[PDB]
Design a protein around this ligand. Structure first.
Ligand SMILES: *CCC(=O)Nc1ccc(OC)c(Nc2cc(-c3[nH]c(SC)nc3-c3ccc(F)cc3)ccn2)c1
Ligand SMILES: *CCC(=O)Nc1ccc(OC)c(Nc2cc(-c3[nH]c(SC)nc3-c3ccc(F)cc3)ccn2)c1
Ligand SMILES: [Cl-]
Ligand SMILES: [Cl-]
Lengths: 314, 301
């Protein structure tokens, strides 16, 4: 009901393009509330069009679901405007997406951050599973940085909302994240919590490689074949076997032998209490989590929502 | 807790726009840039007017630690300091500005629910300070900030004695004594500022004379939109006997009861349309701009 605000074009304006993806383009926007003199920064995503004649009531029905997620590590859909285009509004994250972030800070990112991000993504996915929601497009590009200490999963439900043609399954770099999908999703369009776990495995690989592209050079139309031959992403240079073993367990053919998200929370949290034993990174001692003074300052300005503490080295 | 006050360097922030001035200094909109990042985070900066020596900065710094230690949804927390030649204080930017200029700009477009809820929230904020045995000394409509129209916060705590006759209690004018009950006096003047949509108290009466007219029993007039039950509360805050003025705890309860029957205690033209936002609008505001936890506001019955 009340969790989702219906906007009109008169009360917001796209100000500047931030990025473009398969689901649409994201603009920095301004909400201009009824009868006020302020401009509030917002993020606006104008979606490309769904491959299905989507009734507005069922666009709104999906959006209410998206507006109902209440968890520190999943972004909640705040508003929608249904005109010629479908435009979604939510809180602007000035730090951008986690894939761009790890690429840009490749040389100054330590084990404590990498492992805590793992935990927080797993926490956000565990929430979705408890709500019986399947993301279908979990990836590092779909994790946003609210602060460097706080990441949140975005864009859930949009894969099932917009769908995709069958041509973009059998084609290179399109609207279907073939190289992030479990084999059963590629072959049969089967999407469960356990194939979200597969995508979580690929997401962790992106982070541990500081933003490498998975299976680069192998055409997307061939990924289904190499997966059935047993080929998987290689062990990132900074990962001990403990971390690589978890990754490979997520890419097992039999879905129900993959780990559960709740298990992944527990093991990545264990590893975050002694991060130097599980990731080998040069200069890792010259990189720490923020001090208490710095986290209190970050939170009071920009991140006031309830959140569990980051897992620190004992 | 020394970890509640960040010591800023000049290199990591910049003043962008002037937002206003005050008895204590000049207020800027600024941008904080964290080290190693490329983002620009808006902040409010207050630059004090007088320059200070190292010995004077030590007294300022320890007072700042107390300001940084206030934690309540209706009192603004001091977040940082930069000890230059001329001191600068940093807190979170309240984009809707100060309530004084807000009510002046929205004169005949503010419903009764907003006014009474602002009085509840201000009282809650002062009651927190009293509970911590902290005296504001400069409560006024210009020192209540608007985070959202539904959420206001007292600012500038502790600045007064660290470094407003027509807001002060008689005992403070005559003998420079400041107590929680003198804060209650200025609460009444603040409520008077709100109800007249930002009129100037005791207009055209020189500050040198306020002492003497108060002695003779002259008090600010009944605002036109106020029922006599609102005005009597205000009148109780301006009694010469400090301890028979209302207590901040009692004001929360009184205005909250009134906030549930808002149109019987304030009579406003066109009030049948200025209701506080639906749950939908209020959820939007909070997820977008105001994620801190705060008790619900008092809606009608
Ligand atoms: C990883 C790619 C990316 O999103 N980069 C990026 C660059 C600049 C930015 O502004 C500071 C942001 N902020 C941001 C983005 C989003 C968002 N990102 C995506 S990519 C799949 N999709 C969205 C989005 C926006 C609005 C909605 F209603 C739903 C989804 C969201 C908030 N802040 C990011
Ligand atoms: C009535 C005057 C006023 O404050 N106006 C105003 C106009 C625009 C604004 O943002 C768009 C804000 N936001 C704001 C103001 C302040 C602040 N006001 C004062 S008046 C004496 N003092 C402060 C302040 C700033 C920083 C500190 F560390 C302490 C006190 C604070 C936050 N947002 C206001
Ligand atoms: Cl996208
Ligand atoms: Cl001032």
């Amino acid at each position: 009901q009340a969790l989702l605000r219906i906007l009109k074009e008169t009360e917001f304006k796209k100000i500047k393009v931030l990025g473009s993806g398969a689901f649409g383009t994201v603009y920095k926007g301004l909400w201009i509330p009824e009868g006020e003199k302020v401009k509030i920064p917002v993020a606006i995503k104008e979606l490309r069009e769904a491959t299905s004649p989507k009734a507005n009531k069922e666009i709104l029905d999906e959006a209410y679901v998206m507006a109902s997620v209440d968890n520190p590590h999943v972004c909640r859909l705040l508003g929608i405007c249904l005109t010629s285009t479908v435009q979604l509004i939510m809180q602007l994250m000035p730090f951008g997406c986690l894939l761009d972030y790890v690429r840009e800070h490749k040389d100054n990112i330590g084990s404590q951050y990498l492992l805590n991000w793992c935990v927080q993504i797993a926490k956000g996915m565990n929430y979705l599973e408890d709500r019986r929601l399947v993301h279908r497009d979990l990836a590092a590009r779909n994790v946003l940085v609210k602060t460097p200490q706080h990441v949140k999963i975005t864009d859930f439900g949009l894969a099932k909302l917009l769908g995709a043609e069958e041509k973009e399954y059998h084609a290179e770099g399109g609207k279907v994240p073939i190289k992030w999908m479990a084999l059963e999703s590629i072959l049969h369009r089967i999407y469960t919590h356990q194939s979200d776990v597969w995508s979580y495995g690929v997401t962790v690989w992106e982070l541990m490689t500081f933003g490498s592209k998975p299976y680069d050079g192998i055409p997307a139309s061939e990924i289904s074949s190499i997966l059935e031959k047993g080929e998987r992403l290689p062990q990132p240079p900074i990962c001990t076997i403990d971390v690589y073993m978890i990754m490979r367990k997520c890419w097992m053919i039999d879905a129900d032998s993959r780990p559960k998200f709740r298990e992944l929370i527990i093991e990545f949290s264990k590893m975050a209490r002694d991060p130097q034993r599980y990731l080998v990174i040069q200069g890792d001692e010259r990189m720490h989590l923020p001090s208490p003074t710095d986290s209190n300052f970050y939170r009071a300005l920009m991140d006031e929502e309830d959140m569990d503490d980051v897992v620190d080295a004992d």
